[PDB]
Design a binder for this molecule. Structure first.
Ligand SMILES: O=C(c1ccc(OCCN2CCCC2)cc1)c1c(-c2ccc(O)cc2)sc2cc(O)ccc12
Ligand SMILES: O=C(c1ccc(OCCN2CCCC2)cc1)c1c(-c2ccc(O)cc2)sc2cc(O)ccc12
Lengths: 221, 232
């Protein structure tokens, strides 16, 4: 059970669950990439402690709400060592000028780059990244689930979320930050999740300007 | 100087800065009432923003960018605060208390109405304190538009560093309140996380709100006009 994992077991479990880096006119290639990444995201999600404990429909609701944020935080994480570029795939590395080549995408491209720089600046660690990605999955769809079962599901989510918060703090203490630094960095990282939400919402409007439930359900069952 | 404030003075300053609760303005359509209401609160939001420690130290341009990004999240978080004691209802104004049946009559509104309601539920179940609320509303102002700053110039980096120091101060202030309420360190870090994850929902509701309102002078120029006082 997720609730009885230590901090180290949480980290280890999330690190093990990491999906592969996939390989790649542009929207064709990006779409093809993302669609293939989704199949592995579902697999990753089944390994996030606590996630399989939820009902199938709740599982679907969470992925339905979080999938683009998850693709974007992975994007932003793999683009950290490539200032001014987004590493969509090891063979698809794109600059803002290439992003301009698509109607509607420069502004989000620009948001994506800036997030990547911010991760670089904070020197985001891999262990921290996997916690953040897990928080997105469990948090993004949660408030948009009055029934008896919903009470139970929400309670479980907020206990797993609390476990992940403990894990982030443990990581920051091991690294030798002061208590004050720990809370400050925790806060810094969580506020970044709000930008990621923002990019995802703008991403979706952009994608829709050119049903997923059934598809996740098939993949999840 | 905002960076020299203690947690208690930070809190006192934020409580003092609180805007008033405005009334809806009508003889006793719904979107007209809501719009007139929101437009009048905007004026007061600018006064509040100037009173948030650290905000006026920024350039006019950055002040306007932060508010252009965050105004609707600020209207929504206030609405959610004032609706906490009215389960199933949104208290837009003491004279405009709406249930979801009434939000359904405005086309496209119900989904966001429900999200606003669930946020209010969450605040109530968490026992959100007034002091936590004002700190969260400040975080929204300073954080929402922070990663959409155009410039990478020296001035810009100074500005962003100042903003991040002020956000850090608010984090210390939140943690201090939780320590004063007797939470263990673990409970403190847990509740801070729960609070900040709610902001990501507030962001989401604002985005969906903006899409809805766009389906119903440029805002940048309006805020500019308001924050740009003369001293006559
Ligand atoms: O360009 C994309 C993308 C393209 C198609 C797409 O979905 C097509 C529908 N599919 C059917 C059901 C499931 C999805 C998703 C993302 C990407 C991004 C994007 C960046 C900027 C923006 O304006 C919008 C989208 S970020 C990103 C990251 C990755 O790792 C891969 C891909 C992209
Ligand atoms: O209904 C509203 C609202 C109406 C107009 C509006 O702006 C009209 C344009 N003006 C030009 C210049 C700037 C704005 C903003 C909010 C509200 C909300 C809303 C809730 C659900 C939703 O689907 C969308 C909007 S939440 C909220 C909270 C408050 O205190 C007051 C008002 C509302």
């Amino acid at each position: 059970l997720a609730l009885s994992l230590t901090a180290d077991q949480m980290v280890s479990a999330l690190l093990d669950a990491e999906p592969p880096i996939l390989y790649s006119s542009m929207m064709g290639l990006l779409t093809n990439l993302a669609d293939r990444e989704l199949v592995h995201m579902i697999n990753w999600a089944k390994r996030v402690p606590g996630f399989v404990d939820l009902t199938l429909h709740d599982q679907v609701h969470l992925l339905e709400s979080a999938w683009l944020e998850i693709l974007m935080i992975g994007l932003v994480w793999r683009s950290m060592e490539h200032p001014g570029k987004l590493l969509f795939a090891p063979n698809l590395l794109l600059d803002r000028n290439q992003g301009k080549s698509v109607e509607g995408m420069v502004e989000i491209f620009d948001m994506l780059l800036a997030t990547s720089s911010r991760f670089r600046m904070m020197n985001l660690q891999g262990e921290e990244f996997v916690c953040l990605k897990s928080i997105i999955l469990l948090n993004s769809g949660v408030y948009t689930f009055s029934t008896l079962k919903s009470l139970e599901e929400k309670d479980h989510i907020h206990r797993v979320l609390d476990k992940i918060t403990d894990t982030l703090i443990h990581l920051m203490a091991k690294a030798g930050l002061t208590l004050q630094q720990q809370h400050q960095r925790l806060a810094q990282l969580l506020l970044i999740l709000s930008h990621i939400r923002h990019m995802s919402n703008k991403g979706m409007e952009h994608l829709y300007s050119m049903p997923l439930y059934d598809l996740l359900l098939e993949m999840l069952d």
